[PDB]
Amino acid sequence: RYEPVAEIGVGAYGTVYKARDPHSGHFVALKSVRVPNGGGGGGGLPISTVREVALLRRLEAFEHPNVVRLMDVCATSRTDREIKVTLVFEHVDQDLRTYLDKAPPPGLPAETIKDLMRQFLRGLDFLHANCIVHRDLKPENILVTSGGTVKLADFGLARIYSYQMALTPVVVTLWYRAPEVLLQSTYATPVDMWSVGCIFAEMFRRKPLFCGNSEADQLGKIFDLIGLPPEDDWPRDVSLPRGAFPPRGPRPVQSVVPEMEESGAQLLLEMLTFNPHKRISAFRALQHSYL
Amino acid sequence: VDYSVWDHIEVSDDEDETHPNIDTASLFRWRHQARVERMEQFQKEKEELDRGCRECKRKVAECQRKLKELEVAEGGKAELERLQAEAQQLRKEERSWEQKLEEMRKKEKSMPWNVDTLSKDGFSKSMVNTKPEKTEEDSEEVREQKHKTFVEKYEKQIKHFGMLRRWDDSQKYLSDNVHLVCEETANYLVIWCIDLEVEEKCALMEQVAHQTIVMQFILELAKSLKVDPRACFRQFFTKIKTADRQYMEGFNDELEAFK
Amino acid sequence: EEVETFAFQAEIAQLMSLIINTFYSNKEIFLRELISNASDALDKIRYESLTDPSKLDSGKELKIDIIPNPQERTLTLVDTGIGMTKADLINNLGTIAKSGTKAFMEALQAGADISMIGQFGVGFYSAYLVAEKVVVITKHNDDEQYAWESSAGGSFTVRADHGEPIGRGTKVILHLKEDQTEYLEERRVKEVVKKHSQFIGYPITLYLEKEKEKYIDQEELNKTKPIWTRNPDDITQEEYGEFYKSLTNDWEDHLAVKHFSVEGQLEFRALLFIPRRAPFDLFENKKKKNNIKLYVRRVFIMDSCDELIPEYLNFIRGVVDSEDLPLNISREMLQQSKILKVIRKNIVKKCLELFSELAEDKENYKKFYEAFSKNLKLGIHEDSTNRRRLSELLRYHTSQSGDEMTSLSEYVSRMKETQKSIYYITGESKEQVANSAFVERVRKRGFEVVYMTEPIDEYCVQQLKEFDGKSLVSVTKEGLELPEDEEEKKKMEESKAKFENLCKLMKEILDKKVEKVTISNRLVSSPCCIVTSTYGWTANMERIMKAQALRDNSTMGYMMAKKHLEINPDHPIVETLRQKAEADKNDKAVKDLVVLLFETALLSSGFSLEDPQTHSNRIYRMIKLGLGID
Amino acid sequence: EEVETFAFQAEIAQLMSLIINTFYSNKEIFLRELISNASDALDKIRYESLTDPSKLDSGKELKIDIIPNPQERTLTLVDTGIGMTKADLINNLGTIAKSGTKAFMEALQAGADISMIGQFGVGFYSAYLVAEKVVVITKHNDDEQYAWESSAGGSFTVRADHGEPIGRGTKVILHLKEDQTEYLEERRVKEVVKKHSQFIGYPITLYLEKEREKEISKKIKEKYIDQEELNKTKPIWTRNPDDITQEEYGEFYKSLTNDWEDHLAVKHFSVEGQLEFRALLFIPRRAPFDLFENKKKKNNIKLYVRRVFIMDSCDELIPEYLNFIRGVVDSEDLPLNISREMLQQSKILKVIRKNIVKKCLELFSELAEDKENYKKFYEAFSKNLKLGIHEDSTNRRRLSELLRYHTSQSGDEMTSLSEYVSRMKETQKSIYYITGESKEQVANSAFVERVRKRGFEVVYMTEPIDEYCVQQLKEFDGKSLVSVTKEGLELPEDEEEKKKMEESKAKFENLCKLMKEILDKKVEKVTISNRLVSSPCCIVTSTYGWTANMERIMKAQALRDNSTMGYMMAKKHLEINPDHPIVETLRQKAEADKNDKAVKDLVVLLFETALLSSGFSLEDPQTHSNRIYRMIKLGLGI
Numbered sequence A: 001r002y003e004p005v006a007e008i009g010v011g012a013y014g015t016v017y018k019a020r021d022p023h024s025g026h027f028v029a030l031k032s033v034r035v036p037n038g039g040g041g042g043g044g045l046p047i048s049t050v051r052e053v054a055l056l057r058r059l060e061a062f063e064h065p066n067v068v069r070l071m072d073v074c075a076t077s078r079t080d081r082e083i084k085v086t087l088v089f090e091h092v093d094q095d096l097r098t099y100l101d102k103a104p105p106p107g108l109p110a111e112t113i114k115d116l117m118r119q120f121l122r123g124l125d126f127l128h129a130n131c132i133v134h135r136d137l138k139p140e141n142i143l144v145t146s147g148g149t150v151k152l153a154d155f156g157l158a159r160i161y162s163y164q165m166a167l168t169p170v171v172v173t174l175w176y177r178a179p180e181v182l183l184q185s186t187y188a189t190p191v192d193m194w195s196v197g198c199i200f201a202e203m204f205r206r207k208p209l210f211c212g213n214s215e216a217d218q219l220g221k222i223f224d225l226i227g228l229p230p231e232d233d234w235p236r237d238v239s240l241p242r243g244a245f246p247p248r249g250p251r252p253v254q255s256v257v258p259e260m261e262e263s264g265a266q267l268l269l270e271m272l273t274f275n276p277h278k279r280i281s282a283f284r285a286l287q288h289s290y291l
Numbered sequence B: 001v002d003y004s005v006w007d008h009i010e011v012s013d014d015e016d017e018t019h020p021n022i023d024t025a026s027l028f029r030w031r032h033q034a035r036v037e038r039m040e041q042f043q044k045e046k047e048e049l050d051r052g053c054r055e056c057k058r059k060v061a062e063c064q065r066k067l068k069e070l071e072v073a074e075g076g077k078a079e080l081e082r083l084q085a086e087a088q089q090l091r092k093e094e095r096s097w098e099q100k101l102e103e104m105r106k107k108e109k110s111m112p113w114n115v116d117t118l119s120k121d122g123f124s125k126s127m128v129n130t131k132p133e134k135t136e137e138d139s140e141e142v143r144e145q146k147h148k149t150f151v152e153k154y155e156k157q158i159k160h161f162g163m164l165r166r167w168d169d170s171q172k173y174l175s176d177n178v179h180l181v182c183e184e185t186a187n188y189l190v191i192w193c194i195d196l197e198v199e200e201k202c203a204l205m206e207q208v209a210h211q212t213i214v215m216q217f218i219l220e221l222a223k224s225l226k227v228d229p230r231a232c233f234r235q236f237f238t239k240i241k242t243a244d245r246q247y248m249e250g251f252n253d254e255l256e257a258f259k
Numbered sequence C: 001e002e003v004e005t006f007a008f009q010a011e012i013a014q015l016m017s018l019i020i021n022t023f024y025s026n027k028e029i030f031l032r033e034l035i036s037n038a039s040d041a042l043d044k045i046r047y048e049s050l051t052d053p054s055k056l057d058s059g060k061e062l063k064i065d066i067i068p069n070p071q072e073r074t075l076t077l078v079d080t081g082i083g084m085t086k087a088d089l090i091n092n093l094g095t096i097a098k099s100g101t102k103a104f105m106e107a108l109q110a111g112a113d114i115s116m117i118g119q120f121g122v123g124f125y126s127a128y129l130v131a132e133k134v135v136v137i138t139k140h141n142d143d144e145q146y147a148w149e150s151s152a153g154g155s156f157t158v159r160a161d162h163g164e165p166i167g168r169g170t171k172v173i174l175h176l177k178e179d180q181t182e183y184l185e186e187r188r189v190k191e192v193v194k195k196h197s198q199f200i201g202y203p204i205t206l207y208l209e210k211e212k213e214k215y216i217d218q219e220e221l222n223k224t225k226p227i228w229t230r231n232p233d234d235i236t237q238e239e240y241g242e243f244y245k246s247l248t249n250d251w252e253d254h255l256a257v258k259h260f261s262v263e264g265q266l267e268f269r270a271l272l273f274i275p276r277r278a279p280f281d282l283f284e285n286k287k288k289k290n291n292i293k294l295y296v297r298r299v300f301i302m303d304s305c306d307e308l309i310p311e312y313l314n315f316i317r318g319v320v321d322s323e324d325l326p327l328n329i330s331r332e333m334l335q336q337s338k339i340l341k342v343i344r345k346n347i348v349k350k351c352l353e354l355f356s357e358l359a360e361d362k363e364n365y366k367k368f369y370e371a372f373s374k375n376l377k378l379g380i381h382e383d384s385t386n387r388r389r390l391s392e393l394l395r396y397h398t399s400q401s402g403d404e405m406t407s408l409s410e411y412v413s414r415m416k417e418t419q420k421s422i423y424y425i426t427g428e429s430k431e432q433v434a435n436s437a438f439v440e441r442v443r444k445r446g447f448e449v450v451y452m453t454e455p456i457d458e459y460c461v462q463q464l465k466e467f468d469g470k471s472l473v474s475v476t477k478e479g480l481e482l483p484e485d486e487e488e489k490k491k492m493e494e495s496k497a498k499f500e501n502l503c504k505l506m507k508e509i510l511d512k513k514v515e516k517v518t519i520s521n522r523l524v525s526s527p528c529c530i531v532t533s534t535y536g537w538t539a540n541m542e543r544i545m546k547a548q549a550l551r552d553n554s555t556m557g558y559m560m561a562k563k564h565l566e567i568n569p570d571h572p573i574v575e576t577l578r579q580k581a582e583a584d585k586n587d588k589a590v591k592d593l594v595v596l597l598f599e600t601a602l603l604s605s606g607f608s609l610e611d612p613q614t615h616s617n618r619i620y621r622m623i624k625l626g627l628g629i630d
Numbered sequence D: 001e002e003v004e005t006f007a008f009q010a011e012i013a014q015l016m017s018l019i020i021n022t023f024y025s026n027k028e029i030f031l032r033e034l035i036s037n038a039s040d041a042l043d044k045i046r047y048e049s050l051t052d053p054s055k056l057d058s059g060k061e062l063k064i065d066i067i068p069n070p071q072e073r074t075l076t077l078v079d080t081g082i083g084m085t086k087a088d089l090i091n092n093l094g095t096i097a098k099s100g101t102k103a104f105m106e107a108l109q110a111g112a113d114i115s116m117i118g119q120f121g122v123g124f125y126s127a128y129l130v131a132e133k134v135v136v137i138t139k140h141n142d143d144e145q146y147a148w149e150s151s152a153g154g155s156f157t158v159r160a161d162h163g164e165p166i167g168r169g170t171k172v173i174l175h176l177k178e179d180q181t182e183y184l185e186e187r188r189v190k191e192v193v194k195k196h197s198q199f200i201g202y203p204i205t206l207y208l209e210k211e212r213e214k215e216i217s218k219k220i221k222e223k224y225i226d227q228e229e230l231n232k233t234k235p236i237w238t239r240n241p242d243d244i245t246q247e248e249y250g251e252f253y254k255s256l257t258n259d260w261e262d263h264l265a266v267k268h269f270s271v272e273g274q275l276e277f278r279a280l281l282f283i284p285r286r287a288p289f290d291l292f293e294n295k296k297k298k299n300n301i302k303l304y305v306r307r308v309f310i311m312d313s314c315d316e317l318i319p320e321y322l323n324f325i326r327g328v329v330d331s332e333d334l335p336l337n338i339s340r341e342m343l344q345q346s347k348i349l350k351v352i353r354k355n356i357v358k359k360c361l362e363l364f365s366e367l368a369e370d371k372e373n374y375k376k377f378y379e380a381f382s383k384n385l386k387l388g389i390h391e392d393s394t395n396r397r398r399l400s401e402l403l404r405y406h407t408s409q410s411g412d413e414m415t416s417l418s419e420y421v422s423r424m425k426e427t428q429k430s431i432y433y434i435t436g437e438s439k440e441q442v443a444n445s446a447f448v449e450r451v452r453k454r455g456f457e458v459v460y461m462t463e464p465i466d467e468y469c470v471q472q473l474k475e476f477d478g479k480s481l482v483s484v485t486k487e488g489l490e491l492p493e494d495e496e497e498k499k500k501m502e503e504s505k506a507k508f509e510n511l512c513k514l515m516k517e518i519l520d521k522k523v524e525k526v527t528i529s530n531r532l533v534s535s536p537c538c539i540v541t542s543t544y545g546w547t548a549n550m551e552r553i554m555k556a557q558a559l560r561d562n563s564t565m566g567y568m569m570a571k572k573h574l575e576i577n578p579d580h581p582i583v584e585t586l587r588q589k590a591e592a593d594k595n596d597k598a599v600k601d602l603v604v605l606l607f608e609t610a611l612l613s614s615g616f617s618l619e620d621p622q623t624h625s626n627r628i629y630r631m632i633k634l635g636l637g638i
């Protein structure tokens, strides 16, 4: 509504106009800053600039005879733009599996894995806090972004694979499924961690930790690393012929899995331990000095 | 003084309850599922508890009938005693099913508020503004009434447009005063320029003449585009502010001719 | 004994100062609170007159009169309510956290259609945010006229008034502070009126000293009436249109309107409106999201659309008027924001229904879609739960269509009995993709493709993985599957062997320019063409993403899709090259040609040209050779 | 008539319910306000003991302890502060809008350094947001132990000493509501106190059931957790800047935000004006992945009042482009509302922002001296700089001096525009630059060939944000900026060579006319320019409209299909290099036969390649390639 009759020299305030007040005739340093207003939380003031022109407008009320303000609370032109501004962002499709395919040979930087591990476990703590059930979580349900950010998705068969999927989602070698899955029990903190524990070893190896055929055979491969006892350290919820699994020793996870620092070997062995109550929680592992 | 009734609202898509390591695109879907499964389990339990209650109710009701019959029966009072005890057991069972139902009622009281419990579709009525019947009005007859009363009604506002100079002031002015984007406005502005000439206000005349052709410009390509000027006047300001000076001048010459 | 019992106390001297300093932030709300109270009293009259019409003998008119007085720097507000007795003035008016509204609402428990607010019992004192002193003069139907005077200094006085009589109701004199004279401005008053009193049922008038400078009764101050409060079945389109035009100030009426109300623990009425055209500020990040405003009992609380609706629905105009919400002591804020999320969900569902019905109206849908398809696509991109619904609204131009868009389901209805995927092609323009070599064989095989010509389509199609059980496939990527006649398959394998060493040679020539060189029957008129690996950005996605000012270039280590050189073995050029390889694989001129062909293909395939200068320089060379320059 | 005088009254029964039910929406303020009160009592001791050490005879240690009791569903707050007398429990604690901190506000004339936190006299009653009942057991040194007790039911009681040793401060018993058991959780407690009691002078500890190995020692772990850690981070800005070193300041940064690396650049801000406050500015060594993700709420610069977290309104505290500087603003002079959740009179933040921004600029200027870390800074946040320059018109004089570019003379060395200017030639009266898609593109562009021949330095610009910034930066150090991509590139040159060009224009006059006809509706005007050296021709942008790069950027980046603007902005011309062999030949060919279609087709080819070399997309690249394939077939004898 103001009428520029001349311009004020260019300074910190860029282009400033000497604009006339059509009512009083007063000339004020017509200034302006380009503005946004948010904000993916929804439109609503940038308040930093609308407020700026408003402070400066407030100075007029003092008439303070040394406060050459921006002429008016308005955030208008003042010829600049528009060319309106708006942003759109790309979704990250960098599947953990893709990460692993892009990843280097056995001995994947433990420090990188530590960070990804603690990100995963941090995510789990949230998921456990929200009682998120997802024993069906597998490597491919883990996202590793371009910034190395672990994002978890696909929380159990109940809300996943609504479109074309695998015909052998279970029949496939379940080297990434907890014994409790293989025993046909349920989901738990130890179940989830057992799954990813092998995945973490996969990350180190760039290659699945275990690989069996049936659920009993899968355990027959699992047992080779974590050790095996007879029918005296098996949970109640067991569909597999517990006691028909000839006992054997463990194989120092530290030496089996590439660059597996002993502290993480311990954490992994705890995650891999057959008995879900002998495993370590996501929180405990997360807070372990290894990470 | 008491809004505690809304302290327990569950929102499955609560975007303010997220996590950096979690993809909420699927989490929210999980939450939905969980809510549904919980309701299914709840409902099942309630129905089974109600069923059991009613079963024991009927059992004891029939036993009570039989108690009356055993009382009447000549020596059936020995059996009566036995049955009374059994009937009391059935009553106690009924009671315990009801106590469980009372616990279900307590569970309902503790139940989180959501789109399925907070409210129902009280009313819904859609409408698509198709029409208002392909027709046409004689704009000369319209102007006979409009030009005479519209122009006077908005004379001051028409003049305010004529007193503008910046393109955004003109754009935003008409954005607020969209009903001024018409021939009656432009015609007044021409007349006003003439009156300004007579009054020796040539400076104003030229400013108004500028704004005259701005409104005429709007009318010019609105007619070319076969659209209502009020639906596209902002595109004239978009064109003016972006046109290469050489073409802008050309448009202004075409415009002057259009006026 | 060992315990003493005390009643809770309240230091009014301090409490009062808290009331008129810390309880409120905005101060212009003093008009809202006083007017609200006026309308409560006007409802009190109405109710009472329902039982005894002679109560209207002391004036039969229900309204609020606003009369500014700059000569005194005061503001006179005349409330034509029942009035207050001396007892009410000293009991209710001069008491903190107390309102006769509640007692009246207790009277309303006997059955009424009356709706009032005032559960806090403090709003009166907000007058002292602006006014230095407030005088309340009243004349209850059952009592004498009294003057209630106080500056909120811990006390107030009451005396029977003299001079001008009040039939009923009360007048408020706001002795405005010296720095509060801005509320004597017409504009400022109207600003507040439109801010919070735009739907007051009773007439509010503004008196202005205008032509002869006399108080002119601005009766139209709040002429805007509630529509959602009326029975929708009795509301015509003209009325919905006029409301919309009043709502939005848009000379053009709405495209569609939908009433929506919920009942239960959550209860409200509402009107949703679809505009006929998108605003020039639709993609404006400086636009305030306040298309649908929130009211309680027709009292403006907030315009919190930020939470109320989805961003991709940020074009629908409307009003939501709730019956009972958990407002804070400061009515500008609502407690339990999850309520707004619940409301949102209900609105979204109804918006989707409206869109579906609008889609039934093909002609207006087309108009709608043309204006807001971008928002639809943004919904596909953003909303993972209603995406399916939103995809039903998608419309594209396809090979068997003209310039008429068609749904993906219509595409599906034209799919072949051996077709399990939706063929498509993205690009800058319809003509560009129409002339692509990638859709030539597709057309030769009798297939239709979906033309996708917007940059947003790269984000949209990212989410469009499957539609009605049908997969989707880009003709621009590797692995394009078209019907393979076993005879032709054998011939292609023979061709692969035929041009095997040729492809190897080309790869040697362009080892670091192309990832793989191979023939492909996807090509028809072109001798070669560059395709995008299924992993990473497409030529289009890449180009578009590389136009983003704020992009992070280091992320491209995860997005640089492999480029492969497809060869069309049926061309004389390709055949010649094969023969030239046989003649001399080390022939420089041939190798130069291979390079030229690649860049020609790369460029024409929509991929970035590494060096347009050098490329054109090679051309200039060839031109000079044709010209005989050198 | 007779004027009756009345005191204002209050319906306490209604008032109380309003205090609890309508004053707060966030129940997390429960612990905040309780702790704040405890710290006030501790402040009271500090003063009394300061002036009279014997005040500590019944206890010297000053702290706030919190002990949860899940078995009761209650919480215990241990205030080791001065406590309250029976009279205070009745008068202060038991009265709405009554606070003994006011008594200290008046009493502490000597205690000018004793700053109590808050003063409304109502916050206590917010305890009942989550508590069913509250009992306050206390023994001020000037009285005995009493147990104040109330469930906020319109009354309260006070009981005599029950034997539970309270010789100082108070034990606050918090009876939690059935549905408020989440506050018995370690995590939940920590979440709340970390957001509100961050900078409490007195240490806050928790007594928690310690997660431990089964007590079968064989193994056993400790039974309880002493969570003193809550206050491990102390106020830094409260100390003298000159006495604050990085050995502690950098530790503050990594504590400020979870970043295990010292900051890049920092700036202490001390304000002694009406709005007294101190603030710390922190610049990260690396930009965050969410730097431009404006979908997330800002939380870098946070606002504290009396060292208590109040707001995090970065939206008002800083400019959008400065949303990378993390920090603390701490003022004790702010008019917070009754809830304390929002500052009244936003004009305060308006002034504060401006003053902070000034110091941001000073920091940036300081960094400019440290070229090594400046370049690190610059590259980490160059886009933010450029965003500021573009959008923040109030500080362009300073922001534009922070710009650094690679030029034709600096090569791979990124240099200042001030350095550019100081090294300009006496004929170089304007800043020459070029924008494009990449450095090697613009460095090999025909647009900069003659420019280099004339000895001028070209600023290379490659980002879309650069393309945007040049739409704002018109002059720098008094000299205008000239894009070499636009028509009218008036390079300083020998007038005689200009005459030679005019002679060339006559020579190729008919050629230009023919080409214009050939390229009718393809190019606006065909002409001659010596900016070209190795190329026969070049498509140039006009003095108005979008540049080829700008079109690329805006057309693909903007979500709004503003065809009106694109239309008006889509301007371009064709320049000819009269010295080029092809151009020379074309003239000869035109003279031989202006109607020779083959020549005309050659002109079209060159035009299309000129578009390509200038970054202008072809309207149908496939036909371009087809021409190429045709020409190839001709070469192959096909």
Ligand SMILES: Nc1ncnc2c1ncn2[C@@H]1O[C@H](COP(=O)(O)OP(=O)(O)OP(=O)(O)O)[C@@H](O)[C@H]1O
Binding pocket: C033, C036, C037, C038, C039, C041, C079, C080, C081, C082, C083, C084, C088, C092, C093, C098, C099, C100, C101, C117, C118, C119, C120, C121, C122, C123, C124, C125, C169, C170
């Ligand atoms: N126009 C009027 N006519 C009669 N009585 C009135 C009028 N306006 C206000 N009052 C009286 O003023 C008293 C003080 O109530 P006040 O309006 O401050 O509380 P409230 O506004 O009803 O509650 P809230 O603070 O929630 O708005 C009420 O008891 C009411 O009777």
Ligand SMILES: Nc1ncnc2c1ncn2[C@@H]1O[C@H](COP(=O)(O)OP(=O)(O)OP(=O)(O)O)[C@@H](O)[C@H]1O
Binding pocket: D033, D034, D036, D037, D038, D040, D041, D079, D081, D083, D084, D088, D092, D093, D098, D099, D100, D101, D102, D117, D118, D119, D120, D121, D122, D123, D124, D125, D169, D170, D172
């Ligand atoms: N833990 C405590 N120890 C000692 N006094 C307390 C305690 N809690 C409350 N009080 C009493 O409450 C008074 C003020 O507390 P209250 O918080 O209600 O007001 P405030 O803290 O001054 O400001 P606010 O009301 O905003 O918190 C104190 O002066 C003191 O008398």
Ligand SMILES: [Mg+2]
Binding pocket: C033, C036, C037, C040, C099, C101, C117, C118, C123, C124
């Ligand atoms: Mg009221």
Ligand SMILES: [Mg+2]
Binding pocket: D033, D034, D036, D037, D040, D117, D118, D123, D124
């Ligand atoms: Mg306190």
